[PDB]
Amino acid sequence: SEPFEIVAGALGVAGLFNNCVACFEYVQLGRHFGRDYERCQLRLDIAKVRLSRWGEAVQINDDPRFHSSAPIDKSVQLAKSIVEEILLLFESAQKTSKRYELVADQQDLVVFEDKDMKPIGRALHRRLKDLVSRRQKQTSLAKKTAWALYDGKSLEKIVDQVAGFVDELEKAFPIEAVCHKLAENEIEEVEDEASLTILKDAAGGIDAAMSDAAAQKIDAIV
């Protein structure tokens, strides 16, 4: 119910955006994900990075238009609506999850911890988390509470909708080139093909810029 409270407040785009990004931190994945755990965790991580990349490109913390409750500029009004919609998406996912916990038995309520990931997925996950931590202006934000995604549909919906919403966000601002360069910089630290191939597969359908940067880099060996 926290995302709902945030949307009910008087934040500008920047405050709403920073709450969107922080929403990703304490989502857990149910044991149901099985062997798809790593890719699904990374698709969540990628959706987050995508959001962080836009904020960076648009200089969210330095553009005064993003700091008012009532923006005038159409692009910024669009951005505000989109970022509110992302929060509503997390709110609704938390509701679905709550309905599941109400009816399920203890066996179906087991979740993965970060240590459960394969070593390569684990390492990409750390790299993707740290990358947005650098970008994210430091937390005034109150801590959020942990909750779990228990089925694939729920995760797909977040990851797919966030990605579409960032597409809309990028469309509204003159940041086409900046975002592609940023995607290139994000990936300069991963050298081995194994990690690049896992990244490109998880980025499929949700981050064309990361997918292109990874596909181009795998040729710097093959």
Footprint on this chain of its own copies (rule: CB under 8 A):
4, 7-8, 74, 77-78, 81-82, 84-85, 88-89, 91-92, 95-96, 98-99, 102-103, 168
Q: Rounded CA gap, 33 and 151, in Å?
A: 7
Nearer to its own copies, 38 or 84 (CB): 84
Query: What single letter denotes the amino acid at residue 193?
Result: E
Select the binding partner of residue 35 from its own copies, Cl ion, none (C-beta < 5 to 8 A, by kind). none
Q: Rounded CA gap, 188 and 183, in Å?
A: 9
Stretch 63-92 residues interacting with Cl ion (CB under 5 A): 65, 67, 71-73, 76
Using CB under 5 A as the criterion, what x/- string covers residues 5-34 for binding Cl ion? Answer: ------xx-xx-------------------
Residue 29 DSSP symbol: E
Give the pair of three-digit tokens for residue 222: 């093959």
Nearer to its own copies, 104 or 194 (CB): 104
How many CA within 13 A on the CB side of residue 33? 26
Q: In angstroms, what is the minimal distance from the CB of 98 to its own copies? A: 6
Give the pair of three-digit tokens for residue 173: 């601002």
How many CA within 13 A on the CB side of residue 183? 26
Q: Which residues bind Cl ion (CB under 5 A)?
A: 11-12, 14-15, 65, 67, 71-73, 76, 96-97, 149-150, 154
